[PDB]
Design a protein around this ligand. Structure first.
Ligand SMILES: [Sm+3]
Ligand SMILES: [Sm+3]
Lengths: 566, 584
DNA sequence: GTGGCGAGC
DNA sequence: CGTGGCGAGCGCTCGCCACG
DNA sequence: GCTCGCCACG
């Protein structure tokens, strides 16, 4: 009767619609649009959804087959057209749209028609020949397109629902918590519109970089960059500046900041180091958006000053600022440090020793000969360690989730739960997570450090029993083979080590997750364990990984680096 | 747009491709590779050639600069890599190769990292220290290797096999290759090819390996690495021995000498000859004499070097070895060899007297009857006070002595005139196998006895015509050759030696025809020995046209025997000679 | 028998 | 996010004929 | 004729 995709689509609509303040962010014609959607037949809405999920290109009705809708879709198509949501081939007025709708033989045929010198050239060459040259509709036949603007309305609706959600989700269950809305994230309708346009631009730029289209990426970023200033004096940014960090990330300014940050990577990829420096200086000159990115900025900036521009003195100043700033995490900190020594110890910098005066005072390797992790596991199977897990960060993060579930999801923290479809509270990757949950955190982590083995086992079982299967981003319900395996592991790790790991994850998930060794192996009898990082040929320890090997070693956990040789 | 080096490389490769029978000496996969090169983009080929002349090591990608090829080399690198011609830093797995690639600061950094002793230490000591540190089946070396690669960065290396293929192709192009090849213009002649020099692919390969070894040995000796030069030489010695009884070697012995120099055996013979000098340096004089005996036991390779060989053997028997009787025997056998040049011959006789007059060998007098009666003259020697180049001081003195003109041109002066007088015979048609390709500066038999014997009728007629030629004839013929070949590259002729055609005509007028005929005869008959003895300087009074050939010798610089022989020859033909000594 | 190449699909 | 349909791109083989 | 990159679908 009622297909899943439409159910999901209708859930999102209901959630946004019943909440009146967000509903105030749409004009009358737009509400009229949603009304029109509601007036569609079911077959119409189902077709509309199936089409709406595709990026908008013209599609021949002979491309259309949907048993789940109708064995002949035409009356559905008529309905959607009459409603003003679909358009037919009679509205084809863009040359490129028609050119690209035609398959290969047709374009070849048409090429033969006009006495094009070559009819058998590449498609793109014919496309270009036609464009220079500038009935294709006469030969094409019946076609349909999703109408632009109404899809942009639904686009913004969907955007609003979850700004950052699998297909199974309509079947899937999220954790329970309570809704807490108090602050308005978008100042007005137009603010939402500017937000959405920034989003799409960032998505274009990202796409470009992924495909190596760096020159186009730079143009698109340069346009974005222009459009920004000419806004970044606008009123709404005001109330955006008043939003907490974990909500501020969903503002127009934050998005364009991210855009500028990719611009840095673009400039560097193109070896335009100078321009890059300016963007870095610019980003570091404000502290309003993306504090989390400050560490990345200084770290890249120093490298730009130190090794390609080679203007050493302001490089020194940069590094010193870098270490001096509060928001730098440990990884970038250490990287900056090693660079500080590096500049400090070359005859090139024999003189400028006097500018290095603020300076702070800031592992076991082995080798063996398809899967490098599985080879390691086989070896430790020989070494008496009958259990082992290749799960990287999710293993430990999963333990974190199992030990601190009720705190991660505790009531009383405004705006971290905004709807019933979140995998985690919104402040998770910010320091304010910990500062906002300090009393429960501090007392329970102390409770962990001193807890006897079986207590850990008991708490793990409790969470496992009460929570298994539901989506929590911290927990991979398939990382462990069984509750028992997890109980055996917590028994081997013991209370202080667990305490240490949970501390790191709670203080800083974004970087703890990225720091954890691939492997963990243990003997189920003796509870002797080793935490092993695995490196094949051309695989190297990152700075983050080195920091966490040290940290785990400090907690008394035994760590090892296993290199597989070709 | 289409750069010179690619023009040049394409000429060499095409010239080779156009001859099918030489092409039969390569297998399919190698030709396939060259096909693929030909199919590459222009930027691709440009890059390969620019990398090709750069020597075989890994090279850091941040050092490569080629604006004229590509502002971004990434996709070109990609093309050459996919095509199997280059490799990237991803393929660097030898610890030593990466340790060799690293700059000084980087190696210093790495050294401090592993708490290596003497970190301000020298590069090479740190390299050796790392390799020992690695030797802590299997080893801790691989991990060190990773980290050295990490600091080194993106790097490329020219692939070994394909480079070797192009290597052999260039080798074969010029059995006789600086930049100017694309633009330089050769004399005309017609190709006359009848011989296959290489029996098959592996014979060429053996040939090439001998070449590279000789190259190494020469390089080693030059750097004073006598120990490594000796090991390399001994390896080569076995490598020549372990080639014994090869079929193709018989075929090498069948072809004429002037092409025999283009065989593996000739090259190893040259290697053995330097081997003599090597062992002498290291005082292995025993091995020396033996090796020399070995060289002289055959007359198949480098007969031209026999004069050097006999003379050095005599010396070795004569002195430190102090084995006097066989020394006498050696000198006598030496003189009995007919192919020995006059210079060393004079040297050898001089040694016969020299031993005869130290009481040590008075008893052995019965062995002293071989004596020629040709005793040693002294012509006109003079001295000047030095302060500058010795030649230039001499020139200044002769201008004070009324010789307003002067040229410091050594042999190339007369050789140039030789070239002007006999050009069309030097390049004449009808002599098979002296011209093999379009890029020769000289006929292949030029420095070989068959040059003269193969062109005797035309030569005898032309030297007779020169001996009798009046001034006007000489000047006219010189102008003819000058005009018809001006600009063309002739190995005899230096187109910068003379001030102008007119000066050259004035010089032939001053020295005169009979002398010219005499000189051309000697150098035509025996170039490698005539060309070498000619005086550094030549001055003349432009009024009387009286000229002098002057050899200049600063303190501690002495007449060589060939120079002394040619002063005597020149005086005999009536030319006047003088020797100028500069005092410090 | 072999190579080298050009045309099919 | 991982996998399948599926179009676009592209290589391949084989076969001819000159020739030792 | 094949494999590979791209876009629907749970
Ligand atoms: Sm279907
Ligand atoms: Sm340059």
């Amino acid at each position: 009767e009622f297909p899943y995709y439409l159910r999901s689509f209708l859930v999102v609509l209901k959630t946004v619609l019943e909440n009146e303040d967000d509903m105030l962010l749409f004009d009358e014609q737009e509400k009229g649009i949603v009304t029109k959607f509601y007036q569609l037949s079911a077959t119409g809405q189902k077709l509309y959804v199936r089409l709406f999920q595709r990026k908008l290109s013209w599609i021949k009705m002979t491309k259309l087959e949907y048993e789940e809708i109708a064995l002949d879709l035409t009356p559905v198509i008529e309905e959607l057209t009459n409603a003003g949501f679909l358009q037919t081939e009679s509205e084809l007025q863009e040359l490129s749209e028609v050119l690209e709708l035609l398959s290969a033989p047709e374009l070849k045929s048409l090429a033969k028609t006009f006495h094009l010198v070559n009819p058998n050239g590449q498609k793109q060459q014919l496309v270009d020949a036609f464009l220079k040259l500038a009935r294709a509709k006469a030969l094409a036949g019946q076609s349909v397109r999703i109408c632009k603007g109404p899809r942009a309305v639904f686009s913004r609706i969907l955007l609003l629902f979850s700004l950052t959600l699998l297909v199974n989700l309509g079947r899937m269950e999220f954790p329970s918590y309570t809704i807490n809305r108090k602050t308005h994230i978008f100042q007005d309708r137009d603010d939402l519109i500017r937000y959405a346009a920034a989003t799409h631009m960032l998505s274009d730029i990202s796409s470009a970089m992924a495909n190596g289209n760096w020159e186009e990426a730079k143009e698109l970023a340069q346009c974005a960059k222009r459009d920004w200033n000419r806004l970044k004096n606008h009123p709404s940014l005001r109330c955006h500046e008043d939003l907490p960090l974990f909500l501020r990330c969903f503002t127009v300014g934050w998005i364009y900041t991210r855009i500028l940050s990719r611009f840095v990577e673009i400039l560097q990829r193109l070896h335009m180091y100078e321009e890059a420096v300016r963007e870095l200086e610019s980003l570091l000159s404000q502290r309003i958006y993306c504090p989390d990115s400050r560490g990345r900025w200084w770290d890249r900036l120093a490298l730009n000053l130190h090794q390609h521009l080679k203007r050493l003195e302001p490089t020194i100043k940069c590094i010193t600022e870098g270490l001096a700033d509060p928001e730098v995490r440990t990884g970038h900190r250490l990287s900056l440090y090693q660079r500080a020594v590096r500049l400090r110890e070359s005859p090139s910098c024999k003189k400028f020793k006097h500018l290095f005066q603020q300076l702070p005072e800031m592992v076991k390797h082995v080798t063996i000969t398809c899967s490098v992790e599985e080879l390691a596991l086989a070896h430790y199977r020989r070494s008496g360690f009958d259990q082992g897990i290749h799960g990287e960060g999710s293993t430990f993060s999963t333990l974190y989730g199992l030990l601190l579930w009720d705190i991660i999801f505790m009531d009383g923290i405004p705006d971290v739960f905004r709807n019933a479809c979140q995998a985690f509270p919104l402040d998770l990757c910010t320091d304010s997570f910990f500062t906002s949950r300090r009393p429960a955190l501090e007392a329970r982590l102390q409770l962990i450090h001193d807890a006897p083995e079986e207590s850990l086992r008991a708490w793990v079982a409790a969470t496992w029993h009460e929570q298994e299967g539901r989506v929590a981003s911290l927990v991979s319900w398939d990382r462990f083979t069984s509750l028992q395996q997890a109980q055996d592991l917590v028994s081997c790790l013991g209370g202080p080590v667990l305490s240490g790991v949970c501390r790191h994850l709670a203080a800083d998930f974004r970087h703890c997750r990225g720091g954890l060794p691939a492997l963990v192996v243990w003997n189920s009898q003796s509870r002797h364990f080793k935490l092993v990082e695995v490196k094949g040929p051309n695989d190297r320890l990152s700075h983050k990984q080195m920091i966490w090997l040290a940290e785990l070693q400090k907690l008394g956990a035994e760590v090892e680096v296993c290199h597989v040789v070709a």
